[PDB]
Design a protein around this nucleic acid. Structure first.
Ligand SMILES: [K+]
Ligand SMILES: [K+]
Ligand SMILES: [K+]
Ligand SMILES: [Mg+2]
Ligand SMILES: [Mg+2]
Ligand SMILES: [Mg+2]
Ligand SMILES: [Mg+2]
Ligand SMILES: [Mg+2]
Ligand SMILES: [Mg+2]
Ligand SMILES: [Mg+2]
Ligand SMILES: [Mg+2]
Ligand SMILES: [Mg+2]
Ligand SMILES: [Mg+2]
Ligand SMILES: [Mg+2]
Ligand SMILES: [Mg+2]
Ligand SMILES: [Mg+2]
Lengths: 99, 145, 71, 62, 183, 71, 140, 103, 140
RNA sequence: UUCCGUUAACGAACGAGACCUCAGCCUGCUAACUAGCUAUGCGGAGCCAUCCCUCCGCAGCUAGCUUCUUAGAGGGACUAUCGCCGUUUAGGCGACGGAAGUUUGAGGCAAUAACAGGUCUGUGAUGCCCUUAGAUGUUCUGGGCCGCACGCGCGCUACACUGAUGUAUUCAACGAGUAUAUAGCCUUGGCCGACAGGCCCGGGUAAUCUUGGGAAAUUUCAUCGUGAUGGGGAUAGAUCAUUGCAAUUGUUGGUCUUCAACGAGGAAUGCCUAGUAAGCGCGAGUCAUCAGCUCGCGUUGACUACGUCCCUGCC
């Protein structure tokens, strides 16, 4: 798992997401369950821009020891053409035209 | 340019909570009615002076050349009277501004303002939404231990 | 408590730093030019930047400030 | 007797819970007699207090 | 004399005796003259704004107790009118002056906090006066044939004279006494 | 334990017609407390004295009826 | 003075004057169940006024004067109020339909109110005239 | 032309519905047809409130879900031909166009 | 108002019950068991008895007519839906049960269920609730 | 952890705020036969006729218009201006103006790290274990989950005259609604019926019909008259209707009768700073029927404070 989650992170960041996060919860190695987060980049969590900038999924793996959880949160970049990501810039982002 | 225009019609509204009262003013003989009935009959009776305040202060002489027909809907039995109050005051102020010179408006508006700003400006207060966890906006369910 | 955050304060000083010339002492004129030399994502945030910009633009007239304002 | 003293400066919410205000007052018959008295209730600079006993004063910041 | 309470009672001839309690009873200034003890005013946003509220309205608001009478301000205004008529009948004077005299002769001036004796501010003084007056009238009316308006009139009349037959004055006396015992 | 009567006796009718018109304030409660009569009897006696013209009326209402003397 | 219509007079006085007018006219036939029934089921006593039938007739006549199209269910809602449910919270309740229907039929047997094709009841020209000519007699 | 056409438009989004309405009223005003609209009906607020907990433990916290239905009515006077020729442009997803012929 | 009467009786012995003479007649008749406020109101109207009087003000004849109505509401045209014993089990006759007869009918109705071993009769016999209420926390 | 300011830290990032939704303002804009206003015409009534005036109804996609209603776009507040305080900073208090000056109000979203927190009885999410035909599967019948010496928690109804009762009277908002089969859901109108309810014509898949949502508290008049009383309505008897396949262990709704405790509640302890508390009612979910519950809504509408670390907890 520690090698596939970092691979997913790698591919997402080369694809172009501003930030990505992976969570693996379940009986990973031992009988007691633990949660391993795999975060890299910049990720917002609160406010309305979350439901414009955060593309997220939750999937189970049906393994031999039980069910493993996967939360993948991909933070998109502001696309002026609105194809790769949101067309609206983040509210706090301010751009000053150079004189 | 510096001559009074021919007296015409104005329509002005007042508000309190969800009650809205709209006063239609036309050149007339001093009649003032609310929903067809004369204002001297508005109820509740012990809030009747509240609706009479704009007339008692501007004087019944300032209403001779206008007929006031007021339609009021919404709210309750207090907010409707407070809405009719503001509708009368704002209707007289607007009528003096378009057909009776700005100075006289200014005087009547100053009288209304020194008595009560609610006569001219609506109170922006509305019911606060209820929150789960209590039976009211702020009140919470009784806690036990 | 009406304490301005860094985003409002930082933008205010950067706008005065570059466009000191085309910045007046009036809020309503400053919020119009702020729309021409910047891209802000909210009217509420644009108003707060121009209100603090006007605030700073008057303290500059007083004489001491911790920006640069070479002039 | 009843002395009426006009508050001139309000300094501090005293008591364990802040229920009492320590204040300076110049008396109405003696504008040279400035005493620190403790007030219960909302008080501001300029309201007259009818200090019934006007000799005891109070300890500052207590 | 254009603005009169209930269009029946004049404001101009009201003399607020106490200089201390002058800016916290809103009767003298022409800005505080009202036709009705009903304003729906926002006299609670700031700390010292209830002082600029008409004093008859402050008396009226304390009648909306207890919970069974909460929010019933038109009935409270009716009680005030029927009380102000009985006051004029039994005293032959202006009922507003009787009311301001009762509120003056009822607010305790010294209290015991913590047990150090402290002096009451004018605003808390008028608040306590009104609270004691309406509380005594209400307790007199409870389970009694006498109407709340008549009990309020009797309580106000006995408090205006200074008689110790008014619940408010007896209670003011107890309060200030405990601040004399615990000086 | 109130022992208010519901019907006058002739002596109490005489006192109602003589002493009561000398009262300053006349309301059903005051008459009930003084003459030791019921509130219904008080209201009806007030109506009768208003019929014989021995009182005036200062204010009438459903809750509070206020009457006074003409003399 | 006169020249006062229904929407010029105090309703409490107009209803009292028109109930007396109706009782004087003698064109109202009262049911057997006038001294028995209650105006609604939430009521716990029959009306305490002997002329309550004429008072309610005047009330509904005035209501039909001011509005057109009121049905029997509408009048049940108009004269319905709060029901106290003992140890349970109070709710709204409706009035009796038999009383409303009988009084409205009695008022049709005077040419005061007719029934409109659009539903409910309308005021007739004679009924409008009667109410307006009684409103002028009401002292101001 | 002759008949009276009521185009009802409904949607869950305001921008798509409004730009479709703008396209319709612009096409109507190019072909010189008189158009009464767009007329905005009161917005319907479909509300579901449910306990967020999948069980009965914790603070009883409630999430309030809302679906807002926006209704637009356009009233032209014309023949069916021009109406289906106008309401044949790319109607954006979520917008429910509905044409009804009146007298 | 009305002064008094030499015949004014403070206690009137009525249907083996004591009625206060200082009480309005309608509410005074609710002292006898089986007569409530509404049945007393109907009895007072049907007997042509002033409702603004007091119990002691009435004479012998007036209470005799009140008892004519109370012991036979039917001859005086009181509808059958107005009776506390509608459609009796054994008799099948509608009647108004008053006084100790109410307790007698209660005891007989309970004995009927206590001989057939009906559930509700056994609930009565056990001293527990009979109308299907929870008994765990209330009724203690 | 909001800034200022001190400074071996500077510069950032998450979180906070920004953001989003609802509400508050706009006689500016856009537009209404599923919203209205105003005028005109006609008709009705009044006055007395007519006329005028007043109150109504109807009509006019050629009567105008958008103030009121709706809903889109925008605008609008920034503490902006003033005084004072403040290191004269960051900010605070007061004041004018202003719809709004308490980041305008209220929400939604909401970091890191946790807890053997709850849920295997939401899941055709699940590992393992048990059972699997005389089954722990499934279905049908009946019963129970409601059982009652008692203890505890959330509540409703009260203890009354600032009221109860009976007239008169007239103001909301949020929302919901059908398979048309004879008809299903919301029901208008007419008739019968004291009520309960029933019957008969219909409207509405809905700003169109229910619904201008004919809510109560409140208001008005009268009665009651300090009496557990016309306060209270528990318990109980008889009886009639409705939902349902079925109502007994009372589904519920009515009618008459019965008429308990309770006269404000010990020690304790809860919630709450403005359209708030409290009062009052309505809608929705549940639902064939059953709301004393929750989630919303509006109506009426205060007192008190503008602080403190005394208690409780957290940092
Ligand atoms: K689960
Ligand atoms: K399992
Ligand atoms: K489930
Ligand atoms: Mg936030
Ligand atoms: Mg009393
Ligand atoms: Mg029907
Ligand atoms: Mg209640
Ligand atoms: Mg508009
Ligand atoms: Mg555990
Ligand atoms: Mg259970
Ligand atoms: Mg009532
Ligand atoms: Mg009793
Ligand atoms: Mg009762
Ligand atoms: Mg059940
Ligand atoms: Mg329900
Ligand atoms: Mg606590």
């Amino acid at each position: 798992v520690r090698r596939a989650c970092y691979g997913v992170l790698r591919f997402v960041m080369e694809s172009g997401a501003k930030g990505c996060e992976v969570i693996v919860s379940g009986k990973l190695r031992a009988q007691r369950a633990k949660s391993m987060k795999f975060k890299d980049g910049y990720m917002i969590s609160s406010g309305q821009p979350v439901n414009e900038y955060i593309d997220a999924a939750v999937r189970h793996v049906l393994l031999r020891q039980g069910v493993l959880g996967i939360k993948v949160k991909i933070m998109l970049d502001w696309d002026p053409k609105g194809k790769l990501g949101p067309t609206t810039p983040l509210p706090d982002l301010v751009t000053i035209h150079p004189p | 340019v510096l001559t009074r225009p021919t007296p015409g019609t104005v329509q002005c509204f007042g508000r309190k909570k969800t009650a809205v009262a709209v006063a239609y003013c036309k050149p007339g003989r001093g009649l003032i009615k609310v929903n067809g009935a004369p204002i001297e009959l508005i109820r509740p009776e012990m809030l009747r002076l509240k609706a009479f305040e704009p007339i008692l202060l501007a004087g019944r002489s300032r209403f001779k050349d206008i007929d006031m027909r007021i339609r009021v809907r919404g709210g309750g039995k207090t907010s409707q009277i407070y809405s009719i109050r503001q509708a009368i005051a704002k209707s007289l102020v607007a009528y003096y501004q378009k057909y009776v010179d700005e100075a006289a408006k200014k005087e009547v508006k100053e009288i209304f303002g020194r008595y009560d700003r609610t006569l001219l400006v609506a109170d922006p207060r509305r019911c606060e939404p209820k929150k789960f966890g209590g039976r009211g906006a702020r009140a919470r369910f009784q806690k036990s231990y | 408590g009406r304490v301005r955050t860094k985003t409002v304060k930082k933008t205010s000083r950067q706008v005065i730093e570059k466009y000191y010339s085309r910045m007046t002492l009036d809020f309503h004129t400053n919020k119009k030019v702020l729309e021409e030399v910047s891209i802000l994502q909210s009217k509420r945030l644009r108003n707060k930047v121009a209100g603090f910009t006007t605030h700073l633009m008057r303290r500059i007239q007083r004489g001491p400030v911790r920006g640069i304002s070479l002039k | 007797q009843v002395k009426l003293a006009v508050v001139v400066k309000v300094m501090g919410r005293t008591g364990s819970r802040g229920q009492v205000t320590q204040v300076r007052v110049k008396f109405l018959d003696d504008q040279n007699r400035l005493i620190m008295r403790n007030v219960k209730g909302p008080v501001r600079e300029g309201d007259i207090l009818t200090l019934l006993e006007s000799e005891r004063e109070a300890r500052r910041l207590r | 004399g254009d603005v009169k309470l209930f269009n029946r009672w004049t404001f101009e001839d009201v003399q607020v005796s106490d200089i201390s309690l002058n800016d916290y009873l809103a009767v003298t200034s022409m800005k505080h003259y009202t036709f009705l003890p009903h304003s729906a005013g926002r006299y609670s946003a700031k700390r010292f704004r209830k002082a600029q509220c008409p004093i008859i309205e402050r008396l009226t608001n304390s009648l909306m107790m207890h919970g069974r009478n909460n929010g019933k301000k038109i009935m409270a205004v009716r009680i005030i009118k029927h009380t102000m008529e009985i006051i004029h009948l039994l005293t032959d004077a202006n009922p507003i002056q009787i009311i301001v005299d009762a509120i003056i002769n009822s607010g305790p001036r010294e209290d015991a906090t913590r047990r150090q004796a402290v002096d009451i501010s004018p605003l808390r003084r008028v608040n306590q006066a009104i609270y004691l007056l309406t509380t005594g009238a209400r307790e007199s009316a409870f389970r009694n044939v006498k109407t709340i308006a008549e009990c309020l009139a009797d309580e106000l009349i006995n408090a205006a004279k200074g008689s110790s037959n008014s619940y408010a004055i007896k209670k003011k006396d107890e309060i200030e006494r405990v601040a004399k015992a615990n000086r | 334990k109130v022992n208010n009567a519901v019907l006058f006796d002739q002596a109490t009718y005489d006192k109602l017609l003589t002493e009561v018109p000398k009262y300053k304030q006349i309301t059903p409660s005051v008459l009930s407390e003084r003459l030791r009569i019921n509130g219904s009897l008080a209201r009806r006696a007030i109506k009768d004295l208003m019929e014989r013209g021995l009182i005036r009326m200062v204010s009438i209402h459903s809750s509070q009826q206020i009457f006074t003397r003409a003399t | 003075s006169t020249a006062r219509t229904v929407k010029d007079v105090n309703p409490h006085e107009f209803v009292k004057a028109y109930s007396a007018h109706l009782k004087r006219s003698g064109k109202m036939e009262l049911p057997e169940w006038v001294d028995i029934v209650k105006t609604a089921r939430f009521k716990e006593l029959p009306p305490s006024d002997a002329d309550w039938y004429y008072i309610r007739a005047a009330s509904m006549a005035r209501k039909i004067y001011l509005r057109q199209g009121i049905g029997i269910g509408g009048f049940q809602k108009i004269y319905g109020g709060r029901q106290r449910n003992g140890s349970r919270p109070p709710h709204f309740c409706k009035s009796s339909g038999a009383v409303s229907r009988n009084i409205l039929q009695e008022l049709q047997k005077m040419g005061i109110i007719d029934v409109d094709p659009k539903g409910g009841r309308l005021i007739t020209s004679q009924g409008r005239r009667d109410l307006d000519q009684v409103a002028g007699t009401v002292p101001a | 032309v002759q008949h009276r056409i009521r185009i009802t438009l409904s949607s869950k989004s305001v921008k798509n519905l409004e730009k479709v309405c703008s396209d319709l009223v612009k096409g109507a005003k190019e072909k010189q047809l008189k158009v009464k609209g767009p007329v905005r009906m009161p917005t319907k607020v479909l509300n579901i409130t449910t306990r967020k907990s999948p069980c009965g433990e914790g603070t009883n916290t409630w999430d309030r879900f809302e679906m807002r239905v926006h209704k637009r009515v356009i009233d032209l006077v014309s023949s069916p031909d021009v109406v289906k020729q106008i309401t044949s442009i790319t109607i954006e997803p979520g917008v429910e166009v509905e044409v009804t012929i009146s007298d | 108002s009305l002064i008094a009467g030499e015949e004014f009786q403070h206690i009137l012995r009525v249907l083996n019950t004591n009625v206060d003479g200082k009480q309005k007649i309608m509410f005074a008749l609710t002292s006898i068991k089986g007569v409530g406020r509404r049945f007393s109101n109907i009895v007072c109207k049907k007997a042509d008895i002033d409702m603004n009087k007091r119990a002691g003000e009435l004479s012998a004849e007036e209470m005799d007519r009140l008892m004519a109505v109370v012991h036979n509401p039917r001859q005086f045209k009181v509808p059958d839906w107005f009776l506390n014993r509608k459609k009796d089990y054994k008799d099948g006759r509608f009647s108004q049960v008053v006084s100790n007869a109410v307790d007698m009918k209660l005891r007989d109705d309970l004995e009927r269920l206590k001989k057939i071993r009906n559930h509700r009769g056994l609930r009565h016999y056990w001293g527990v609730r009979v109308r299907g209420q929870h008994t765990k926390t209330t009724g203690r």
